[PDB]
Amino acid sequence: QTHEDLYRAKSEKTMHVVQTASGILTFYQGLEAAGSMTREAAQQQALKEIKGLRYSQNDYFWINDLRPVMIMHPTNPKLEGQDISTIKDPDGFAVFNEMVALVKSKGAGMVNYRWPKPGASEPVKKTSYVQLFQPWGWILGSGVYVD
Numbered sequence: 001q002t003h004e005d006l007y008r009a010k011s012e013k014t015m016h017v018v019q020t021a022s023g024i025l026t027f028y029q030g031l032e033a034a035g036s037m038t039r040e041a042a043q044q045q046a047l048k049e050i051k052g053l054r055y056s057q058n059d060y061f062w063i064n065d066l067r068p069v070m071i072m073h074p075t076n077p078k079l080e081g082q083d084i085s086t087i088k089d090p091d092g093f094a095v096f097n098e099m100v101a102l103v104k105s106k107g108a109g110m111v112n113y114r115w116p117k118p119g120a121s122e123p124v125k126k127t128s129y130v131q132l133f134q135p136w137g138w139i140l141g142s143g144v145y146v147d
Helices: 003-034 039-051 095-106
Strands: 061-065 070-072 108-116 123-133 138-145
Touching: 003 039, 003 061, 003 108, 003 123, 003 138, 039 061, 039 070, 095 108, 095 123, 095 138
Parallel strands: none
Antiparallel strands: 061 070, 061 138, 108 123, 123 138
């Protein structure tokens, strides 16, 4: 039983909720591919639904793209439609640029950074799984706060 085993387990949870939520992307992209909705309408409907999803103690999902621009953020909605390339946490970690570089290399993975909790402003340590949804160039993410 290794350190790697313990960390594999804790973060599996995060991975699985993101994979769960990403099925909404899959569903809506299918309707786009079949010609039943336009891409942009399919995108907006998917965002709207993913915006309301929660698990555990008000843990949530966000979406940003590869540019990077924030597409949907349920607790910081004023970041939406903005270039988020210049955002850095208090340790200097370039949150979204790191996420983009990670998914471009590997498709998905874990990343740690500081972010405020919902409805608060102090940046707290957080560990998130991000996953590229390739047809739309979207990164879906969720994480858990150290407390």
